Design an enzyme around this catalytic site. Sequence first.
Site, short mmCIF file in Angstrom:
data_model
loop_
_atom_site.label_atom_id
_atom_site.label_comp_id
_atom_site.label_asym_id
_atom_site.label_seq_id
_atom_site.Cartn_x
_atom_site.Cartn_y
_atom_site.Cartn_z
CG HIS A 108 -1.96 -1.09 1.20
ND1 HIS A 108 -2.72 -1.39 0.09
CD2 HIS A 108 -2.34 -1.96 2.16
CE1 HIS A 108 -3.52 -2.40 0.37
NE2 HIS A 108 -3.31 -2.77 1.62
N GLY A 116 -2.30 1.98 4.74
CA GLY A 116 -2.52 0.55 4.85
C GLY A 116 -1.47 -0.10 5.73
CG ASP A 143 -2.79 -8.70 0.72
OD1 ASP A 143 -3.85 -8.10 1.02
OD2 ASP A 143 -1.90 -8.97 1.56
CG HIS A 145 -6.37 -5.35 1.83
ND1 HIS A 145 -5.93 -6.37 2.65
CD2 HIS A 145 -7.37 -4.73 2.50
CE1 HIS A 145 -6.63 -6.36 3.77
NE2 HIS A 145 -7.51 -5.38 3.70
CG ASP A 232 -4.82 -10.25 3.75
OD1 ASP A 232 -4.65 -10.85 2.68
OD2 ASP A 232 -4.70 -9.02 3.85
CE1 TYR A 271 -2.63 -7.19 10.78
CE2 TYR A 271 -4.91 -6.57 10.40
CZ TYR A 271 -3.58 -6.23 10.45
OH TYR A 271 -3.19 -4.94 10.18
N1 LIG Z 1 -2.17 -5.94 3.34
C1 LIG Z 1 -2.52 -4.76 4.16
C2 LIG Z 1 -1.26 -4.13 4.86
C3 LIG Z 1 -0.43 -5.11 5.73
C4 LIG Z 1 -0.76 -5.23 7.15
C5 LIG Z 1 -0.03 -6.12 8.01
C6 LIG Z 1 1.04 -6.92 7.47
CL1 LIG Z 1 1.92 -8.00 8.50
C7 LIG Z 1 1.38 -6.82 6.07
C8 LIG Z 1 0.67 -5.93 5.19
CL2 LIG Z 1 1.16 -5.89 3.50
C9 LIG Z 1 -3.62 -5.04 5.22
O1 LIG Z 1 -3.63 -6.20 5.62
N2 LIG Z 1 -4.53 -4.10 5.74
C10 LIG Z 1 -5.50 -4.43 6.82
C11 LIG Z 1 -6.30 -3.14 6.87
C12 LIG Z 1 -7.47 -2.85 7.68
C13 LIG Z 1 -8.09 -1.54 7.57
C14 LIG Z 1 -7.53 -0.55 6.67
C15 LIG Z 1 -6.36 -0.85 5.87
C16 LIG Z 1 -5.76 -2.16 5.99
C17 LIG Z 1 -4.54 -2.69 5.25
K LIG Z 2 -4.25 -8.26 -4.30
ZN LIG Z 3 -3.87 -7.39 2.93
#
Ligand SMILES: N[C@H](Cc1ccc(Cl)cc1Cl)C(=O)N1Cc2ccccc2C1
Ligand SMILES: [K+]
Ligand SMILES: [Zn+2]
Length: 342
Positions: A108, A116, A143, A145, A232, A271
């Site tokens: 992000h 993000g 991913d 997202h 995720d 997560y």
């Molecule tokens: N993939 C995105 C960003 C991210 C978070 C944690 C870890 Cl360990 C790697 C990454 Cl690359 C994500 O998981 N998001 C969760 C979330 C919830 C609300 C608003 C934005 C985002 C981005």
């Molecule tokens: K993606």
């Molecule tokens: Zn993600």
Amino acid sequence: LVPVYIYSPEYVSMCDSLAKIPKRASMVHSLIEAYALHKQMRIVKPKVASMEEMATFHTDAYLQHLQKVSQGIFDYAAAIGGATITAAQCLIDGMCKVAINWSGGWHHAKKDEASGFCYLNDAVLGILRLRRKFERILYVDLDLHHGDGVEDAFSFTSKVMTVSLHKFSPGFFPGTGDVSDVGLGKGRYYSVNVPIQDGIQDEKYYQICESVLKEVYQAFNPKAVVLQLGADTIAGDPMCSFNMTPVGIGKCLKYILQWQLATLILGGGGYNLANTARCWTYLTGVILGKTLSSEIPDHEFFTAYGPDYVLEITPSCRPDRNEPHRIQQILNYIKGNLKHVV
Ligand SMILES: N[C@H](Cc1ccc(Cl)cc1Cl)C(=O)N1Cc2ccccc2C1
Ligand SMILES: [K+]
Ligand SMILES: [Zn+2]
Ligand SMILES: [K+]
């Protein structure tokens, strides 16, 4: 030409203290280690990103601003970015065909803005290093997202294509990535977006994925690949959208591997700590081509995998929100966009 595994104790101990993913790095590592997989890859210590190395994408203003606030995240950003550069370096020196950094994939992050939870885009950084030796680079993001940071990074060029299979729906971050999003300039139609709904499962996912990667492959003709595999999307995850298991993602992985291109492998969201460890171990097995045992081998975090302590993940009871008719609309549209790619 054995796969390179980007690891050092200091790299894991550091990532361990990242926010909503506490100790995740070591869970992944030690579970992989507990399947003896480390014994099959070349361990390469991650090198810390220099200032100039990050400024290849991010502005000095943002990079400095990142030092200030982390008064920290900057050292986080420096470690992880460096790890991905390092893996991409190994691919270019040709000591491997596959390089792994499970702590990377922060898609992000923008040029001079964080979002993000990504304060530095290591994916971009690695794509840039690869460019030293590889003409065309295919960034594939699986991913949950949209990979908007990596897409933005290169949206104007045709020398790097991004393809993103993500959840697209109102209220859902980042709220971008519809099939109508194709890039701009000489790089128009070289961004690819595959908007997907909740509840989708391994089979339908791999059909959609293979379908697109086959078209993109013929159309673009990559010399390198960068693959973000955020966990995720796996059932049981707090994001609670898709209904995937590692088997489905590995099928996408293995498909890509057939190409035998230099392939920088990255992690991502996820997560659900133990589920995320289950997934990337399985995938790391897929890369090694060695089926693992269903029973989690006793190791430092064995209890985290109770009550059944198996590697296989079960789909939850939920609706598949993806109508076959809408999916074909999405694909045919994508197929339209690819008539422009040469
Ligand atoms: N993939 C995105 C960003 C991210 C978070 C944690 C870890 Cl360990 C790697 C990454 Cl690359 C994500 O998981 N998001 C969760 C979330 C919830 C609300 C608003 C934005 C985002 C981005
Ligand atoms: K993606
Ligand atoms: Zn993600
Ligand atoms: K592009």
